[PDB]
Design a protein around this nucleic acid. Structure first.
Lengths: 130, 72, 14, 122, 120, 144, 189
RNA sequence: UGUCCUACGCCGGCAGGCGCGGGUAACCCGUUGAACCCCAUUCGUGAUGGGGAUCGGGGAUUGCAAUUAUUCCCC
């Protein structure tokens, strides 16, 4: 190939560092709450070349990948691919992201403590659930 | 120590690819990846480009090992 | 410190 | 006017059908060059490459294949080709030629005429 | 409090077929299959014991062996004793603990604290 | 002019068929194509953007070579190795929906015939098309 | 005329050593189209001398645990290796291989004589067949060890190994191993 | 191996459902359409897309009963 002048060697998206030199679909996977499959789905819904590296992009495209990523159901990523399906709180099929995941697992743990369930007590002990 | 390879080209790299590479006797994506500190993908791409240009001969194309020759 | 109704058997978990 | 032999390797059985034709060797409806393990393509072309297309001039061979794996199947096929040719030479051509061909084939590879006696032991 | 974007008042007044859509899969399956005789009896008992109580006071505890029972929104408010093989555990049913089974409240085994080993 | 499907490099023939399918334009493509897997046994989505065409072509070829195949048969063909994690690996069939929609699509294009026999075989028109593609590939192989 | 892989000459191949002129079999009658032959060579004793040398090499290259059955792979490796060799030297690859074999095989070895406990080994002479076998083993091992965790292919690495052992340079693993064994065998006596 | 083995259509992203047939069996499943392997594609020596433990949400069966995850499926 050639030498890209507008190359981002280091990326920062959603308070998580992304390695720009890595391949796009496997570079988004670096953030929490996004696996490979999901990334692929996003990038096929974003209409972006999959052969491209993460630093080998414009900003608008990146912003639109972000947009799609945030609000998956609106961009026709259908209701099974999402991380959290029926939430115990609001019951919204929404995919969770980087910090959100940390918040929400924590929340779950708290609720399981509160309830005094068996799983909860196991988790409090420092033991196995399954 | 860890190995740091250039995922995309530099001018020094590009010149050492257009001039130096089509005169190696054995040209292998792995050898080019080892000579000039390049990732195997990028090196492969370069090789392909060089084939398309008509600077470098092809010996055998395979799923694993693709072998190339310097022209004359 | 133990909750109101819970028994001696489950108390070991708390 | 027509001969029907078999070659067996392991489990794989290949039946070759030799007849007065125009020089066609087709294995299960496809040419010898059009069989999948093309790394092991030369092994299948050995009876052709050894004796020449000149001995395979007016002979049509249809090879029916069944059983085994891939390599085994190949080995069966090649065997049955060679055996087929030999039987045809015996039957409708002279004996001396048959003797010659057989000698050639044994002198190159013994497996090409006589079958491997070993198969999967209990 | 809210459960799947639905409040307690709504939940209580909700259809039985509508809960077969607002639960986890297991629970949905169970409700399709139907509540067994014993379960029904338990539920009726609960209904009685919450009905026959002073408004200020917490209702009288109903003892049960059914740890295969799913907690419905109708049980929220009641105190239930659940057998764990040996002893009962008096459990106040909270709104948070509907999509669970009664079993996961009364633990059937004591947690392990290791004694120092003998001749091995 | 006498060539046949069986006497041609198979992969190349498949490719050419796929190309033909694409350039024609008409084929019933489902909307989930950029989202779907291809079997419970596989890990990721396929790499090809136009994979559906390819798969259709493959199916057609299979029908040609061996008739009286159904959806189950097609699922059994395209199956493979399920990576069962730390448990040892087993065989698992392909995606039933995908095969089903391939067969419905090709049948829509008058290439596949639904049968009295049970499953599905090939139309005469479809066969003709296949043999044309085989000729094309052949010419582009013996002269090349 | 029979050519290996349908391209490699066998009539140009010249054996240097008189000792191994009997046991490296490639010259005339033993020359075959492919390495893969799958005839029995472990049937009776000394029979693996009548087995082609390329075939032998192939059979020792699949030796390792995860690769334990896969012979087509091995033959592809061998083919590509040969091609690489040709590209490099210009010489006939079979000849090169033969040279490597000649220069890799140990000539003397220290062996335990006495009882279990007496750790003073006596340096003894080495069989020609064994020297061939051992050489092959060493070469394959070198190929393995050069190609474990790098971008280098086994075909490439193997080729490199074989050229290094053909030239007699101290960059080959096999050569090094020979040197280590041989010096020891010069020490014990 | 089989009176639960299942063919075939339809609905299903996926486990699966729904419809309809054959087989008490060299007949139908079943030319048992297997996996390795082979052939191309992308990755490039890094805890890496290797490796998958552990976990968090859903869904689906099996069953009188799955809470101490039966099992399977998808993130």
């Amino acid at each position: 190939l050639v030498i890209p002048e507008k190359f981002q060697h280091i990326l920062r998206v959603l308070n998580t560092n992304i390695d720009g030199r890595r391949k796009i679909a496997f570079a988004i996977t670096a953030i929490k709450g996004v696996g490979r499959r999901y990334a692929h789905v996003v990038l096929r819904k974003a209409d972006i070349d999959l052969t491209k590296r993460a630093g080998e992009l414009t900003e608008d495209e990146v912003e639109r990948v972000i947009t799609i990523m945030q609000n998956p159901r609106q961009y026709k990523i259908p209701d099974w691919f999402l991380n959290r399906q029926k939430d115990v709180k609001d019951g919204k099929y929404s995919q969770v992201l980087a910090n959100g995941l940390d918040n929400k697992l924590r929340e779950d743990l708290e609720r399981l403590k509160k309830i005094r369930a068996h799983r909860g007590l196991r988790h409090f002990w420092g033991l196995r659930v399954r | 120590d860890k190995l740091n390879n250039l995922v995309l080209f530099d001018k020094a790299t590009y010149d050492k690819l257009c001039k130096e590479v089509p005169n190696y006797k054995l040209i292998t994506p792995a050898v080019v990846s080892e000579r000039l500190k390049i990732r195997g993908s990028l090196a492969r791409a370069a090789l392909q480009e060089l084939l398309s240009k008509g600077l470098i001969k092809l010996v055998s194309k395979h799923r694993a090992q693709v072998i190339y020759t310097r022209n004359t | 410190k133990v909750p109101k109704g819970t028994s001696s058997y489950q108390a070991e978990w708390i | 006017q027509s001969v029907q032999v078999f070659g067996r390797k392991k489990t794989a059985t290949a039946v070759a059908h030799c007849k007065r034709g125009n020089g066609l060797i087709k294995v299960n409806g496809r040419p010898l060059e059009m069989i999948e393990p093309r790394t092991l393509q030369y092994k299948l072309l050995e009876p052709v490459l050894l004796l020449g297309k000149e001995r395979f001039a007016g002979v049509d061979i249809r090879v029916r294949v069944k059983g085994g794996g891939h390599v085994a199947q190949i080995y069966a096929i090649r065997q049955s080709i060679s055996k087929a040719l030999v039987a045809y030479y015996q039957k409708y051509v002279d004996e001396a030629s048959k003797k010659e061909i057989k000698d050639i084939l044994i002198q190159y590879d013994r497996t090409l005429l006589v079958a491997d006696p070993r198969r999967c032991e209990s | 409090f809210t459960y799947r974007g639905v409040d307690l008042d709504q939940l209580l007044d909700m259809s039985y077929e509508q809960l077969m859509q607002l639960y986890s899969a297991r629970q949905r399956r169970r409700l399709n299959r139907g509540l067994r005789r014993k379960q029904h009896s338990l539920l009726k008992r609960l209904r009685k014991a919450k009905k026959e109580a002073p408004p200020m006071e917490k209702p009288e505890v109903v003892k049960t062996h059914l740890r295969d029972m799913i907690i419905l929104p109708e049980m929220v408010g009641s105190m239930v004793g659940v057998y764990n093989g040996k002893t009962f555990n008096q459990v106040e049913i909270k709104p948070e603990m509907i999509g669970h089974y009664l079993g996961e409240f009364s633990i059937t085994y004591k947690p392990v604290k290791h004694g120092r080993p003998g001749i091995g | 002019p006498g060539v046949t499907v069986k006497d041609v490099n198979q992969q190349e023939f498949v490719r050419a068929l796929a190309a033909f399918l694409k350039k024609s334009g008409k084929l019933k493509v489902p909307e989930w194509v950029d989202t779907v897997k291809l079997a419970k046994h596989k890990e990721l989505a396929p790499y090809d953007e136009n994979w559906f065409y390819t798969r259709a072509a493959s199916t057609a070829r299979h029908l040609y070579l061996r008739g009286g195949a159904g959806v189950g048969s097609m699922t059994k063909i395209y199956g493979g190795r399920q990576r069962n994690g730390v448990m040892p690996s087993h065989f698992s069939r392909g995606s039933k929906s995908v095969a089903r929609r391939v067969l419905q699509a090709l049948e829509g294009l008058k290439m596949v015939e639904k049968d009295q026999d049970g499953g599905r075989k090939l139309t005469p028109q479809g066969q003709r098309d296949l043999d044309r593609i085989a000729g094309q590939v052949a010419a582009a192989n013996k002269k090349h | 005329d029979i050519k290996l892989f349908g391209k490699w000459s066998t009539d140009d191949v010249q054996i240097n050593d008189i000792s191994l002129q009997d046991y490296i079999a490639v010259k005339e009658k033993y020359a075959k189209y492919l390495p893969h032959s799958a005839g029995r060579y472990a049937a009776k004793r000394f029979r693996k001398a009548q087995c082609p040398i390329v075939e032998r090499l192939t059979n020792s290259m699949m030796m390792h645990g995860r690769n334990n059955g896969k012979k087509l792979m091995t033959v592809r490796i061998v083919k590509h290796a040969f091609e690489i060799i040709h590209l490099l030297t210009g010489e006939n690859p079979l000849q090169v291989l033969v040279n490597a074999i000649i220069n890799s095989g140990p000539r003397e070895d220290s062996t335990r004589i006495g009882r279990a406990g007496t750790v003073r080994r006596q340096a003894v002479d080495v069989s020609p067949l064994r020297r061939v076998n051992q050489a092959i083993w060493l070469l394959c091992t070198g190929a393995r060890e050069a190609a474990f965790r790098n971008i280098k292919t086994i075909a490439e690495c193997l080729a490199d190994e074989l050229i290094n052992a053909a030239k007699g340079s101290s960059n080959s693993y096999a050569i090094k191993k020979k040197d280590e064994l041989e010096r020891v065998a010069k020490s014990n006596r």
